[PDB]
């Protein structure tokens, strides 16, 4: 179909793939033009179809696929696309190698698009290929259906259903995998309105599963499981009436431990994932939780195979054995499910098993019981927090088990639950936990057990008071000093860390032990980077615990050693946090150490986005590394160095903390950090952590400059605010949008009055609109899915209200004009059924009056079942009578009723309504209305509301209510809601003889009476 000329030229080029680079240039610069692209695509499609050289055909098919997107295939003439399609199809039906038909299939897929004229030759080609006796023909057909799922819509329903049913049952496992892949792929690509069309085939798929176990093909079973895992995340309700069959089948696979791990782990994952996508379905079925618990407990047993003495486990690291895969999966599975379903559902089936396993003569079951409880403790905390002497009655007796890994196992529970059940367990079970853990620190126990007990002491210490730790400290430290003398490095390192965080909790109670520990620490440093890092961490944490004055006995020597260590990646982080910790200790005396500490932080915080314009094949190949991630922006892939950008964030966080502590002392760096680090970080579109860290950096930097000193502060703020504003109408992540608004408020708070210009205020209104528009759109968005986590929208709308309030305040009103442009959207929120948008709109209006067609909804919102809506509404009515009558006085008995309430959840609402009474009662000044308002006192939660109730109370002054008058003030002060009504009260007590005056305070205890006298005359 091409001139013989063009063929030899292009054949040479494709074959050449000095000689090669000349071909790559020739292709990309000469043969991808408006004048040559059609000839090239025609050529490559012919080579892929007809060439009998393996490499030429393969590359051409690959090249054709890539360049088909870029052209795009749409702008290709009719006569040539027809020839290209027909040649691709002819090559498909010919005899090609498996890999080439795969690449032909991928090439064919690029020629199917709603843009293009219909291609019914392909549909009929696929239908017959699916019946072919060659598995590769059947497999490749499903592959095309996977890449182009809309072809499934094109085939008649009575043809496509038998096709998949034949696919699920096919004698070839490659075909079955491809059939399942295509089936699931249909659901992840098409709208839900198309789902009830292949959905009826799920029973056929599930019924095909037992075949994999009969043929002994568990490897193919794992692949199908993974496809099923994806379907559960898309349409869990589809599994509802065959739920028990899924459960029993996964149970059967997992119990069969003659199978390999992949079939067993994927089966577990399938079971697990139901709890994350259909929690109500799991809870309405007792068989799920029982099976899940039973199956994970079996897998946790699989440890130390062919090693009953655990003589290999005793002799190794305190790191995890990477070979105990099924054990690891079982732990995470139980944890994940418990977190989703809660304690009240699966605490009982869990403990029904734990009671049994605790008494076994097989130590692996005794060990597993401890690990299971450790994994399930957090998710089941709502129940297990109450059964907290019960658990220790099982766990603590196992601490002295003959087998060391059961001992280790027992330490792990006490550690895990010290975190999950904090801070209540520290206050309640310190008498049982600490002696248990201490008894295992002794050197007669094996190294692994000492270390894990010491590790558990870190968990306990984190939320333990210094008063509780105090009588245990000496015994704790004498034991840990022994661990410090171990010949095993990981025992030494754990000893240092345990001591450090025991000291952190002990605080000033640790000054007792400074003189004996610090020289031992210095000795270690003077002579294993992990050791020295943990040692310096221990030294500085002790320093912050005992205080600056005590720390100064070794601080300079400690600092000199730090310098040697720094200029000599775990170590780098230990050194950074040590420097930062010393700054918290020394205060302003850290300033001379800034030239040492800051410059390396500056370098790391200036890292750019290490981007790699990447290509299809050599991706995923980069995904192996945890320090690399790849995403798609608009079609073309990219590869980004995530770790480098994570390090950037960590450095920015340290710079921010130094700036926060030092304040004015840090002003010298403000201009550099703002222009080279903070603001450029906002343009980091492939890492939202950097964007967030850059935003929070801004107000604190300006805060540093203001305290020290200005056109620079104004120029930097104008630059910072403008880029913050500009981010609002562009930022895709709603989470980041919240940070910018929050950053603006904090910035406005710092800069003060008149800090914004007319342009800025207008561009801010644009951003507010786009933020409100996209939030409304997302919130206005089941047969397949069960009915939150979306406080992201609420938190976003939260901060927006504070920015508007802040902007209104700094403009001193003149933002009223700009704010009218977005009232149409504001109005919709107020009159939308949905609570979050209602609350937002109400709060905005309240801030408006602060400086006709909304009163209808507000009065309706006054009696709302939601307290949040009543609070916002009451404030609006109250604020109306404040500095803006035909509505206030009529609603005045509505708010009487709303007041009558004093419950923690609704205490805030009834206190605003209360205050709303007091200023209707102030501007209009009824004496029975005031008597009603008086029994709403005192106001203890809302600060601004209480601030006024007592202001009014002092106006009504400057009978038998005198002790109700006083106590109303006492409770306000003591609850820290109000802060001189005191002056008024003292006068009321003055008009009484002293004996009657003093007896009012004859009901208050010493605590409050101490405050009362430092309050009154």
């Amino acid at each position: 179909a091409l001139p013989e000329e063009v063929n030899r030229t292009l054949l040479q080029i494709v074959q050449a793939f000095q000689i090669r680079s000349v071909a790559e240039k020739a292709l990309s610069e000469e043969w991808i033009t408006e004048n040559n692209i059609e000839y090239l695509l025609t050529f490559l499609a012919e080579q892929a179809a007809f060439s009998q050289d393996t490499t030429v055909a393969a590359l051409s098919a690959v090249l054709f696929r890539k360049l088909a997107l870029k052209a795009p295939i749409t702008h290709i003439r009719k006569e040539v696309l027809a020839q290209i399609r027909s040649s691709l199809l002819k090559g498909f039906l010919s005899e090609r190698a498996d890999s080439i038909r795969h690449k032909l299939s991928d090439a064919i897929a690029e020629c199917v698009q709603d843009d293009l004229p219909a291609w019914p030759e392909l549909l009929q080609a696929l239908i017959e290929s699916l019946k072919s006796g060659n598995p590769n023909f059947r497999e490749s057909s499903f592959r095309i259906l996977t890449t182009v799922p809309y072809l499934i819509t094109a085939v008649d329903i009575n043809s496509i259903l038998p096709i998949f049913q034949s696919g699920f049952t096919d004698a070839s496992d490659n075909v079955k995998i491809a059939a399942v892949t295509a089936f699931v792929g249909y659901f992840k690509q098409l709208p839900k309105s198309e789902w009830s069309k292949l959905g009826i085939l799920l029973p056929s798929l599930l019924n095909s599963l037992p075949r994999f176990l009969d043929d002994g093909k568990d490897d193919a079973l794992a692949s199908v499981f993974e496809s099923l895992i994806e379907l559960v995340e898309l349409a869990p309700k589809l599994f509802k009436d065959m739920f028990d069959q899924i459960i029993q089948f996964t149970d059967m696979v997992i119990k069969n431990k003659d199978l390999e791990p992949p079939a067993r782990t994927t089966a577990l994952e399938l079971l697990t994932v139901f709890s994350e996508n259909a929690p109500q379905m799991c809870k309405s079925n007792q068989n799920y939780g029982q099976t899940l618990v039973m199956v994970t407990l079996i897998m946790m047993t699989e440890v130390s195979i062919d090693d009953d003495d655990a003589a290999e486990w005793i002799e190794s690291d305190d790191t995890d054995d990477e070979e105990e895969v099924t054990y690891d999966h079982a732990r995470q599975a139980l944890d994940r499910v418990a977190l989703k379903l809660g304690g009240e559902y699966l605490a009982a089936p869990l403990f029904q098993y734990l009671q049994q396993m605790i008494t076994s003569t097989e130590w692996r079951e005794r060990f597993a019981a401890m690990m299971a409880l450790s994994s399930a403790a957090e998710g089941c905390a709502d129940v297990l927090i109450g059964e907290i002497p019960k658990i220790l009655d099982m766990v603590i007796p196992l601490i002295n088990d003959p087998h060391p890994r059961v001992q280790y196992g027992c330490c792990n529970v006490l550690g895990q639950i010290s975190t999950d059940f904090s801070p209540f367990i520290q206050r309640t079970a310190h008498d049982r936990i600490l002696p248990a853990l201490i008894s295992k620190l002794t050197s007669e126990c094996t190294s692994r057990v000492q270390t894990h007990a010491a590790a558990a002491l870190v968990n306990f210490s984190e939320f333990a008071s210094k008063d509780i730790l105090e009588p245990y400290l000496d015994s704790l430290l004498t034991n840990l000093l022994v661990l410090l003398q171990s010949n095993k490095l990981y025992v030494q390192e754990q000893a240092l860390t345990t001591i450090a965080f025991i000291a952190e909790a002990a605080k000033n109670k640790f000054i007792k032990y400074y003189d004996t520990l610090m020289p031992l620490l210095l000795n270690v440093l003077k002579v294993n980077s992990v050791l020295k890092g943990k040692c310096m961490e221990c030294a500085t944490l002790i320093g912050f615990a005992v205080g600056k004055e005590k720390f100064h006995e070794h601080s300079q020597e400690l600092i000199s050693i730090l310098v040697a260590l720094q200029n000599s990646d775990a170590l780098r982080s230990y050194l950074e946090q040590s420097w930062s910790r010393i700054c918290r200790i020394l205060g302003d005396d850290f300033v001379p150490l800034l030239p040492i500490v800051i410059p390396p932080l500056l370098i790391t915080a200036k890292a750019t986005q290490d981007v790699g314009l990447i290509e299809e094949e050599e991706a995923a190949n980069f995904q192996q590394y945890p320090d690399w991630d790849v995403v798609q922006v608009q079609g073309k892939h990219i590869a980004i160095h995530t770790s480098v950008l994570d390090d950037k964030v960590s450095a920015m966080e340290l710079l921010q903390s130094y700036a926060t502590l030092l304040r004015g002392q840090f002003a010298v760096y403000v201009k550099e950090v703002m222009e080279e680090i903070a603001l450029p970080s906002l343009d980091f579109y492939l890492h939202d952590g950097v964007r967030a860290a850059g935003a929070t950096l801004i107000p604190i930097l300006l805060s540093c400059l203001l305290a020290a000193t200005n056109e620079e502060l104004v120029l930097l703020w104008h630059k910072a605010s403008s880029k913050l504003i500009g981010g609002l109408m562009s930022e895709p992540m709603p989470e980041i949008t919240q940070v910018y608004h929050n950053s603006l408020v904090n910035g406005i708070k710092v800069m003060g009055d008149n800090c914004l210009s007319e342009d800025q205020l207008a561009a801010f209104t644009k951003g507010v609109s786009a933020n409100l528009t996209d939030t409304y759109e997302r919130m206005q968005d089941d047969e397949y899915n069960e009915n939150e986590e979306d406080f992201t929208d609420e938190d976003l709308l939260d901060e927006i209200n504070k920015s508007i309030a802040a902007v209104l305040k700094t403009t001193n009103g003149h933002y009223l004009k700009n704010l009218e442009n977005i009232w149409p959207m504001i109005n919709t929120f107020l009159l939308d059924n949905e609570p979050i948008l209602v609350i937002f709109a109400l709060v905005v209006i309240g801030d408006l009056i602060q400086y006709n067609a909304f009163i209808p909804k507000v009065t309706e919102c006054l009696i709302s079942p939601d307290a949040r809506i009543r609070q916002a509404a009451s404030y609006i009515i109250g604020v109306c009578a404040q500095y803006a009558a035909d509505v206030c006085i009529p609603t005045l008995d509505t708010l009487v009723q709303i007041v009558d309430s004093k419950l923690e959840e609704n205490r805030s609402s009834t206190e605003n309504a209360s205050a709303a009474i007091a200023k209707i009662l102030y501007a209009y000044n009824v004496d029975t209305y005031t008597a009603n308002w008086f029994k709403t006192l005192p106001t203890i939660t809302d600060k601004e509301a209480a601030s006024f109730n007592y202001q009014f109370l002092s106006q009504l002054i400057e009978q038998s209510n005198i002790s109700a008058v006083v106590d109303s003030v006492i409770q306000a002060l003591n609850e820290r809601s109000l802060t001189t009504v005191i002056s008024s009260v003292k006068k009321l007590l003055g008009f009484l003889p002293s004996s009657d005056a003093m007896a009012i305070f004859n009901r208050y205890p010493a605590d409050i009476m101490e405050k009362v006298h430092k309050w009154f005359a």
């Binding site: 792990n412 550690g415 894990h452 590790a455 870190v458 390192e493 754990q494 860390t497 943990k534």
Partner: peptide
């Protein structure tokens, strides 16, 4: 040097 899942 702590205990975690």
């Amino acid at each position: 040097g702590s205990i975690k899942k």
